[PDB]
C-alpha cells in the first residue's frame, strides 16, 4: 500500500488551500484514520490531525480534516506565513502505518 500526496503547493496568505492524501488500494475511509503531521525547518515536527478529522490539542482551528472524494484532505482556512512547511499524511492499513511522500506548502 502506497500513500501519495501533492509534491508541492503554493498559496497566498489568507487564502484557503487543500492538501490531499491518496491510497493505492482504493478510496480512503475512516478506518484508515488519516493523520496529518507538519514539519517546519530544523526538523520540528508537530501532529495536527488524526482519525481523519480530530485535531490534537493546541493545533490551530484553521487546520481541519475530512474525506473529499476518494482521498483524505487537510484544509487550511486562512493560510499564515508560519504555515509554510512540509505536511505529511499517514494512513492506517489495519496493522501498520504508512506515510505519504509529503507536500511542501509555500506561502507567498
Amino acid at each position: 500500500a502506497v500513500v501519495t500526496q501533492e509534491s508541492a503547493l503554493t498559496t497566498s496568505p489568507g487564502e484557503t488551500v487543500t492538501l490531499t492524501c491518496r491510497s493505492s488500494t482504493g478510496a480512503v475511509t475512516t478506518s484508515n484514520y488519516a493523520n496529518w503531521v507538519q514539519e517546519k525547518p530544523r526538523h520540528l515536527f508537530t501532529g495536527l490531525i488524526g482519525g481523519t478529522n480530530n485535531r490534537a490539542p493546541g493545533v490551530p482551528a484553521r487546520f481541519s480534516g475530512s474525506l473529499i472524494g476518494n482521498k483524505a484532505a487537510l484544509t487550511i482556512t486562512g493560510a499564515q506565513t508560519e504555515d509554510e512547511a512540509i505536511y505529511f499524511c499517514a494512513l492506517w492499513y489495519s496493522n501498520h502505518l504508512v506515510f505519504g511522500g509529503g507536500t511542501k506548502l509555500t506561502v507567498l
Binding site: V37, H43, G47, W92
Partner: protein, 122 residues
Amino acid sequence: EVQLQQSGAELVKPGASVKLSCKASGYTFTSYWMHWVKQRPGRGLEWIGRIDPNGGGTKYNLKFKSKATLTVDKPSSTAYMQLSSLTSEDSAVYYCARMWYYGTYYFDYWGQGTTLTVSSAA
C-alpha cells in the same frame, strides 16, 4: 510542558547494534502510545512501529520487524528503540512521537530527533 528528549548523535559501525532512548515527561507515560519514525533525505518519513507503555505491546512495519526492537522503562518514563545488524540503509534521523488512541488516533508531540550514521572504522 510535555517534552520528548531523544538521545544524542550516534556513530556506529556496520553490523553492530544501537539503542536509542526517548525520555518522556510532563504527562502520564503509560497513558499514551509511543511511535518511532525514520527520516532519510529524499525518502520522507517511514513508520518503524509503536509501543504501548502499558503492557509493552508492539506493532511493527513489516519491513522493520527484523531490524527494530521497541521497549519501555516505566520508572524512568523512557521508551527505547534498538536497531541491529546495522548497515548504511539505517543511517537516518529517528524520531519518537506520542499518540492519543481513545476514539481516534492522532500524533501530537514529537521529539527533536537523533541522528545515526553507520560508518566503517577506516
